[PDB]
mmCIF file of C-alpha atoms in Angstrom:
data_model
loop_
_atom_site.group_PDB
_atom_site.id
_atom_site.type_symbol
_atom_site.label_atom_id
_atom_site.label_comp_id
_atom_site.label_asym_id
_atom_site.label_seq_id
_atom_site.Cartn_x
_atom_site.Cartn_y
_atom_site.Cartn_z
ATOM 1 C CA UNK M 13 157.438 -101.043 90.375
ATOM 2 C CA UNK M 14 161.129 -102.590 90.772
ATOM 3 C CA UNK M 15 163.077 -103.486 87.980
ATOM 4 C CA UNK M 16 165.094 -106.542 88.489
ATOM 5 C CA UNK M 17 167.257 -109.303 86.242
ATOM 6 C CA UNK M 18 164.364 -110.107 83.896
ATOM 7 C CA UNK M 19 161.587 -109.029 85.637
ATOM 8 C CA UNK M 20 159.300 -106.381 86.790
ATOM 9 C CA UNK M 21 157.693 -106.765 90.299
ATOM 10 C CA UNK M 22 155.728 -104.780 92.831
ATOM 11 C CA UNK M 23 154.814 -107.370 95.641
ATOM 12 C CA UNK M 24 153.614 -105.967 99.322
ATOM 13 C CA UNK M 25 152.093 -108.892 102.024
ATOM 14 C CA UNK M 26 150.276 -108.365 104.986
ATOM 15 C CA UNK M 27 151.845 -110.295 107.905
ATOM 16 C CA UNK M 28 150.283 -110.663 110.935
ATOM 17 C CA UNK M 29 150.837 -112.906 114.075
ATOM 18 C CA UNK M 30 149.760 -112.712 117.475
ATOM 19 C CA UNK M 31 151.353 -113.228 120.859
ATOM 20 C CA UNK M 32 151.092 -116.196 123.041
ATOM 21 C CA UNK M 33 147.347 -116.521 124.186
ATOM 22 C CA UNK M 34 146.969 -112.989 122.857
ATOM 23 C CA UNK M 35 148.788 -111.585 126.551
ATOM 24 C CA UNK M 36 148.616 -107.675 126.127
ATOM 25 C CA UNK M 37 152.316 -107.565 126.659
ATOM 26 C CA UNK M 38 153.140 -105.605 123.240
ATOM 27 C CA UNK M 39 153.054 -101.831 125.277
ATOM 28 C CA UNK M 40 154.871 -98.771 125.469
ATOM 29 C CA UNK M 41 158.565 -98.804 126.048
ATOM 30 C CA UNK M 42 157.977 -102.994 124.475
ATOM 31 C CA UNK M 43 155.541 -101.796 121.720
ATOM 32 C CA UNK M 44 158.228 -99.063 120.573
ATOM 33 C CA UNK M 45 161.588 -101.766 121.081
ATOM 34 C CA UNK M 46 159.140 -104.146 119.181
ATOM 35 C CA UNK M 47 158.846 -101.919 116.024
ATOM 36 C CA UNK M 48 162.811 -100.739 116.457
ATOM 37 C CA UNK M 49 163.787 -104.574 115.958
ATOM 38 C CA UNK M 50 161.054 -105.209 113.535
ATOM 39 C CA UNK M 51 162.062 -102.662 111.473
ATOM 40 C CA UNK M 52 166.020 -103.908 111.757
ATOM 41 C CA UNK M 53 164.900 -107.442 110.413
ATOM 42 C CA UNK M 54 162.925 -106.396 107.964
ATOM 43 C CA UNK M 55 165.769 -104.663 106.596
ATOM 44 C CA UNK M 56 167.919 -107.368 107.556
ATOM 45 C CA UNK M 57 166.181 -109.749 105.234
ATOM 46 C CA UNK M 58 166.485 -107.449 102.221
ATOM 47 C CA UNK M 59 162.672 -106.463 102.898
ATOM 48 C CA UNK M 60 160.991 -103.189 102.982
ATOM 49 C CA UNK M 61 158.765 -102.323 106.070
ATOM 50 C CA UNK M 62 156.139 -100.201 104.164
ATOM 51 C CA UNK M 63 153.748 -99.900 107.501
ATOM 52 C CA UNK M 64 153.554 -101.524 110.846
ATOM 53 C CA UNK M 65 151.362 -101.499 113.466
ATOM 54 C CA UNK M 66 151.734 -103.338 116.757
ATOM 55 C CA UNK M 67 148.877 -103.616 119.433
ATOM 56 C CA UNK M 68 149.055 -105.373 122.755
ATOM 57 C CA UNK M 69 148.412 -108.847 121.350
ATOM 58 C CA UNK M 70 149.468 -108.840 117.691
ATOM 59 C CA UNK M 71 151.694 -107.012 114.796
ATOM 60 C CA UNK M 72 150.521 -106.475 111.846
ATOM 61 C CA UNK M 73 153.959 -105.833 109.038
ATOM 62 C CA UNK M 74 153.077 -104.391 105.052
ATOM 63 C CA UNK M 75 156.334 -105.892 103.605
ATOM 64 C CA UNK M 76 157.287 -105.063 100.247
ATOM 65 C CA UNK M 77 159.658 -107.957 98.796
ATOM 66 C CA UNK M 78 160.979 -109.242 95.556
ATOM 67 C CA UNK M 79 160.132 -112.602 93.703
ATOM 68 C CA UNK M 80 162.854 -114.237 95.097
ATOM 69 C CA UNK M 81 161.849 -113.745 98.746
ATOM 70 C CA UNK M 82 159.977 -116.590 100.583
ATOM 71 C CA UNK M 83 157.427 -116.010 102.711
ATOM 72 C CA UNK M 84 157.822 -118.488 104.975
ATOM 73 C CA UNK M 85 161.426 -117.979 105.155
ATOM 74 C CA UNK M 86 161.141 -114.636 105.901
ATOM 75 C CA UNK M 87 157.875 -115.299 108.159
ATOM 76 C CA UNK M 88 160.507 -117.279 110.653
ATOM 77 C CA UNK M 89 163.076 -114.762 110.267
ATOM 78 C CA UNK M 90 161.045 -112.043 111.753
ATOM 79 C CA UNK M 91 159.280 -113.960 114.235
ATOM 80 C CA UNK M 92 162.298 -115.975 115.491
ATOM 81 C CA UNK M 93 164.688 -112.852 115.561
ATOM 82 C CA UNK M 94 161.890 -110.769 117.141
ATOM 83 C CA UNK M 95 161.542 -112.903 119.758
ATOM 84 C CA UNK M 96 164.996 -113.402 120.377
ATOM 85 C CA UNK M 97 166.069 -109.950 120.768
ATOM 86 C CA UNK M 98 162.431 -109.288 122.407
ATOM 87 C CA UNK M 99 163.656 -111.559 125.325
ATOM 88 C CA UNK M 100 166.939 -109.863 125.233
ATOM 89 C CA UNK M 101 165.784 -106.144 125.274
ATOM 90 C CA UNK M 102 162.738 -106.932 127.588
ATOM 91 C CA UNK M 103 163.697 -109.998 129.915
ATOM 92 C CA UNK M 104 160.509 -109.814 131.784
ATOM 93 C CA UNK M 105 158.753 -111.390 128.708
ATOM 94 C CA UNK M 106 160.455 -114.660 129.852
ATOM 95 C CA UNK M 107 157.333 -115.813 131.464
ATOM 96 C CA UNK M 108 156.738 -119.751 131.327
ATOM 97 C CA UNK M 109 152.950 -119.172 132.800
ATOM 98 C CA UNK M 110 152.067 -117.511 129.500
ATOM 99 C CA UNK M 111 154.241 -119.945 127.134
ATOM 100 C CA UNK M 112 157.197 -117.033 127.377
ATOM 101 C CA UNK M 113 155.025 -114.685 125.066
ATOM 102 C CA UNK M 114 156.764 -114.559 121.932
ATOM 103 C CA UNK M 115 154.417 -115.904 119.666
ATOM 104 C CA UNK M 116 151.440 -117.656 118.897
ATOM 105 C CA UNK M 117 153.128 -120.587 116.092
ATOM 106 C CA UNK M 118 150.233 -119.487 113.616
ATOM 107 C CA UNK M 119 150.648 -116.192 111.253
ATOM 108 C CA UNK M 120 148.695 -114.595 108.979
ATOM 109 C CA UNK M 121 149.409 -113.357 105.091
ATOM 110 C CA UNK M 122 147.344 -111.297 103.106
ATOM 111 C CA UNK M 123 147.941 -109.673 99.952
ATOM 112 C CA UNK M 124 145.938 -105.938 99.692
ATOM 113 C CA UNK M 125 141.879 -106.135 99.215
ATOM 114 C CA UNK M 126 139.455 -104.650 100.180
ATOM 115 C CA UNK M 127 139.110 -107.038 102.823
ATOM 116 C CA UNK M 128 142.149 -106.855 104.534
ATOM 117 C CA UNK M 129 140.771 -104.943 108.035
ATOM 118 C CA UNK M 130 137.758 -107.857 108.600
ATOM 119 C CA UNK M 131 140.781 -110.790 107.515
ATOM 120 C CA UNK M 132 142.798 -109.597 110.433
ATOM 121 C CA UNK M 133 139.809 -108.915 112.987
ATOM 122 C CA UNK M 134 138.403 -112.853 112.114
ATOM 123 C CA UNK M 135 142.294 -114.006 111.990
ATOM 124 C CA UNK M 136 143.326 -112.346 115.513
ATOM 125 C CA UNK M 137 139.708 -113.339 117.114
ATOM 126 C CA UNK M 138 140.292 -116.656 116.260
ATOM 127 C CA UNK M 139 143.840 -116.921 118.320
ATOM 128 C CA UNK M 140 141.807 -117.840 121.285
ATOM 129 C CA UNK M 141 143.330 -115.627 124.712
ATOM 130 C CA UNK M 142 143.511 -118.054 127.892
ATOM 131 C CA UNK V 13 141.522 -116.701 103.619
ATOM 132 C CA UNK V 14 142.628 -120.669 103.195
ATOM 133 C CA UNK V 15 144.136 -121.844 106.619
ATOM 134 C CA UNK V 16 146.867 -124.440 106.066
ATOM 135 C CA UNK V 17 149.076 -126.126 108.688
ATOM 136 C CA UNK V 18 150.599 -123.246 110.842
ATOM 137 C CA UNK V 19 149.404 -120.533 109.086
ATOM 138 C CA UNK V 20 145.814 -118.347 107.124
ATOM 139 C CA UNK V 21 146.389 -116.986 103.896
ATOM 140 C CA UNK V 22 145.344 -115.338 100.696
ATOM 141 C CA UNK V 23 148.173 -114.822 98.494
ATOM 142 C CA UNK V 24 146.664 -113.362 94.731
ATOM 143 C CA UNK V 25 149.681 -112.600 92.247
ATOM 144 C CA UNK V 26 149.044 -110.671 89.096
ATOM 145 C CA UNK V 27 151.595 -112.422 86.437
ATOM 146 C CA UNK V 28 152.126 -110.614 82.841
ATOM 147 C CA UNK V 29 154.269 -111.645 79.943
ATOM 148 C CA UNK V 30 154.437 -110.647 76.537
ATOM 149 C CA UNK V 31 155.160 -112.493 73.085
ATOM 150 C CA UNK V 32 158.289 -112.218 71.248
ATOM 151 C CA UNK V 33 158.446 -108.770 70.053
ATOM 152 C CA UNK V 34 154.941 -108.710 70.827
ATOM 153 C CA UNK V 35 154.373 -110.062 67.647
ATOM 154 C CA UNK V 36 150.268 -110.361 68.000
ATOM 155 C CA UNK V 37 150.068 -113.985 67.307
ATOM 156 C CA UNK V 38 147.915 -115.013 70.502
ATOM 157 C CA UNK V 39 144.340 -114.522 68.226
ATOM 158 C CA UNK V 40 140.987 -116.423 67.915
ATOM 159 C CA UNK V 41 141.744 -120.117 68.083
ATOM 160 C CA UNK V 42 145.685 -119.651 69.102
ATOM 161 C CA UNK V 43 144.296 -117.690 72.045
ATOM 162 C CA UNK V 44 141.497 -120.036 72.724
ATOM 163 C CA UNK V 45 144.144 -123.051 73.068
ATOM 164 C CA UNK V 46 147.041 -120.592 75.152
ATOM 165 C CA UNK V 47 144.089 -120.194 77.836
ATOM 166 C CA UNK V 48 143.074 -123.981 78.377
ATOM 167 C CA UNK V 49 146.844 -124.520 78.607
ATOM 168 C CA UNK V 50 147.304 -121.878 81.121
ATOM 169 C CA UNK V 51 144.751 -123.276 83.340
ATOM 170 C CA UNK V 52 146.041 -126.895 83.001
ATOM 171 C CA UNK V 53 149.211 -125.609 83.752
ATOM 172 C CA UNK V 54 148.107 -123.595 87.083
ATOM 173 C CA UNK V 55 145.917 -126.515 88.424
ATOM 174 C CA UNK V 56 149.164 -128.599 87.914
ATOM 175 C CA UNK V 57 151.682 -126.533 89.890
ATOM 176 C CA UNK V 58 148.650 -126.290 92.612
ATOM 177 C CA UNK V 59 147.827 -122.560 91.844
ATOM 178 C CA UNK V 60 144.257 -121.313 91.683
ATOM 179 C CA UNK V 61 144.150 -119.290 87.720
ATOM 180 C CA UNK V 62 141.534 -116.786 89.439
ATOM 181 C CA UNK V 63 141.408 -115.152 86.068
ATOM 182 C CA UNK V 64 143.209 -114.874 82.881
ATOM 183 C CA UNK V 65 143.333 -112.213 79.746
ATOM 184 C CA UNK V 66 145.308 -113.444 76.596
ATOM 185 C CA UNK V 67 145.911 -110.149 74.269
ATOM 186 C CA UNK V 68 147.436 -110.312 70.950
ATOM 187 C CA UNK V 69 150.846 -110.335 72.315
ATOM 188 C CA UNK V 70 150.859 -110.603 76.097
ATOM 189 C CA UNK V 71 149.127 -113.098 78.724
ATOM 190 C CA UNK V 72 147.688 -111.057 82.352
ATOM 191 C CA UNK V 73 146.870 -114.246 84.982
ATOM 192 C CA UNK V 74 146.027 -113.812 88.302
ATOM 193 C CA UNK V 75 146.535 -116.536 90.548
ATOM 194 C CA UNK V 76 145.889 -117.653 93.828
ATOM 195 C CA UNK V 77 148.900 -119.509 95.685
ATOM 196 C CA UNK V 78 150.051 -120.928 99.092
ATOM 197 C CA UNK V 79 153.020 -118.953 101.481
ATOM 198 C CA UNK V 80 155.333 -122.004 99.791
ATOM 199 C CA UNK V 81 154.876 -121.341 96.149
ATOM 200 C CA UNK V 82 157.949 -119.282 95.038
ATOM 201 C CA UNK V 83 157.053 -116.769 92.283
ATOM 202 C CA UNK V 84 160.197 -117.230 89.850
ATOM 203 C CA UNK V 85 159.656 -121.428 89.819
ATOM 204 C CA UNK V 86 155.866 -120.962 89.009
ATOM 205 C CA UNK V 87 156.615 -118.430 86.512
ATOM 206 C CA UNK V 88 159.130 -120.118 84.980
ATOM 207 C CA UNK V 89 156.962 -123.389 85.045
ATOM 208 C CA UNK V 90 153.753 -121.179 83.394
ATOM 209 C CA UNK V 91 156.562 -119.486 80.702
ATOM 210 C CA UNK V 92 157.892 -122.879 79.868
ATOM 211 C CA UNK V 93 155.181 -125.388 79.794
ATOM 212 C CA UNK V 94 152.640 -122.841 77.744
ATOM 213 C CA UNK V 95 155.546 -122.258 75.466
ATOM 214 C CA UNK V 96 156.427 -125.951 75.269
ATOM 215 C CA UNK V 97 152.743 -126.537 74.448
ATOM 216 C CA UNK V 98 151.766 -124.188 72.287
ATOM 217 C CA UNK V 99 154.719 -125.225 69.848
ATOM 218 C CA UNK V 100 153.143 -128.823 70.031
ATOM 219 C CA UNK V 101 149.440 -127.423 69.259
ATOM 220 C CA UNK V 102 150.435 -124.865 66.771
ATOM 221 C CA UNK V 103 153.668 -125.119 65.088
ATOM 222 C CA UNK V 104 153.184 -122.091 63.060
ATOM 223 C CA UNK V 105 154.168 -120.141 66.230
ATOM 224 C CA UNK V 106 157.744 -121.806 65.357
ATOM 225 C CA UNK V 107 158.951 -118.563 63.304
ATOM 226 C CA UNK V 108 162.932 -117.985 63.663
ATOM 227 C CA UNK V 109 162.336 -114.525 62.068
ATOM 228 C CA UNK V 110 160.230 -113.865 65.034
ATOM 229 C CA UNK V 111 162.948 -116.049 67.875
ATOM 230 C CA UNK V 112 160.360 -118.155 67.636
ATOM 231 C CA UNK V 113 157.351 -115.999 70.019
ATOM 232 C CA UNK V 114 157.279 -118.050 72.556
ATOM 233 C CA UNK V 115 158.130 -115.385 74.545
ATOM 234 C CA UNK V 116 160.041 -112.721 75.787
ATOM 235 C CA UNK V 117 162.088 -113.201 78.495
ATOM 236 C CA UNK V 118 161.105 -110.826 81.204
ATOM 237 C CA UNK V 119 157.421 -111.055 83.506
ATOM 238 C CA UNK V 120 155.945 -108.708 85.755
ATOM 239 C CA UNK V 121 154.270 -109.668 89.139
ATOM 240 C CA UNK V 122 152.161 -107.365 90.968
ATOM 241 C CA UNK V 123 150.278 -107.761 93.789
ATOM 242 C CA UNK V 124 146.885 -105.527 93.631
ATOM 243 C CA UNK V 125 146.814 -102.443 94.034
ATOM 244 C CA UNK V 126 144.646 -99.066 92.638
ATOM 245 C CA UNK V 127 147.651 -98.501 89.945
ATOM 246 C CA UNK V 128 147.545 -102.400 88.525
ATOM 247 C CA UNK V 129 145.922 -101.214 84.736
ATOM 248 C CA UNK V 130 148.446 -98.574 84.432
ATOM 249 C CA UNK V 131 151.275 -100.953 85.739
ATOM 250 C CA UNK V 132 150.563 -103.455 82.873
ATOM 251 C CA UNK V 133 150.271 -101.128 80.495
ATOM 252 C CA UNK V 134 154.124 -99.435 81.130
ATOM 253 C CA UNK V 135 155.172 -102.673 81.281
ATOM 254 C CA UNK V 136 154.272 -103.622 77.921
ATOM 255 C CA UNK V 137 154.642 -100.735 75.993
ATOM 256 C CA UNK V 138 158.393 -101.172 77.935
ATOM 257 C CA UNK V 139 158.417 -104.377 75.583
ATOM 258 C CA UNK V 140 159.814 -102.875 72.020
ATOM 259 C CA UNK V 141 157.950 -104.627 69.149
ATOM 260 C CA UNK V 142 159.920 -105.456 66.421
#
């Protein structure tokens, strides 16, 4: 727990979004830039990146945050700027046939359960992959 | 999970707050009255009051919310409405000797985790009682 002005907070979300039709572009050399920038933002935006995990088709972020912080606020911040410096990094992502990749508009947020594994499965199975 | 416009969640917040000085003043019909003014007061600022203990001198709600609720304006709406309330249904709890109870400044918000018992429990014996 985190002591701040008047308060006493431990707060960790789930995040997890896809990418555009679920295209298995999230691989290697763009997997690892992926979690480099991710892990910038995070910071960026006064959030901790407790875990990350990226597969071809989705990220799933454990941010640790304060009261203050607003998910959706933060939500755009790391999709927007990871798709930004994505296209920058990886130019090859700029592909108009599959939307340009970065991201499916939906996202996913989960506080811990015991749950959490079978909410991301149903979440990411529901982003439907044409 | 709830799915709103853009976006699946499930967002549980544990919320804990303590009296005055913990002055143990939230007993029998005082505590029966905090906890159907707790739930009004969730329902009203559109949070789910998943479940609610009322000791002697501190409150422990968990509630359900949306990505948009902001923790510090529903806690200060929760602090300040059951306060505001609970002066109307039981003026006793108006005690200068005591600032009055209703309550002490500072909250802790956890999301779950296997540590939550203990968490509460430093928490409030970090609240000095007069």
């Amino acid at each position: 727990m985190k002591k701040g002005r008047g308060y006493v907070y431990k707060l960790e979300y789930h995040l997890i979004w896809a990418t555009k039709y679920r295209h298995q572009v999230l691989v290697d050399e763009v997997a690892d830039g992926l979690k480099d920038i991710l892990r910038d933002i995070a910071t960026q935006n006064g959030l901790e990146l407790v875990a990350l995990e990226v597969m071809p088709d989705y990220v799933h972020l454990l941010l640790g945050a304060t009261p203050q912080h607003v998910i959706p606020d933060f939500v755009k911040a790391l999709k927007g700027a990871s798709a930004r410096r994505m296209f920058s990094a990886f130019p090859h992502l700029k592909q108009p046939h599959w939307g340009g990749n970065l991201w499916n508009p939906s996202y996913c947020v989960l506080t811990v359960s015991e749950h959490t594994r079978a909410q991301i499965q149903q979440y990411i199975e529901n982003q439907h992959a044409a």
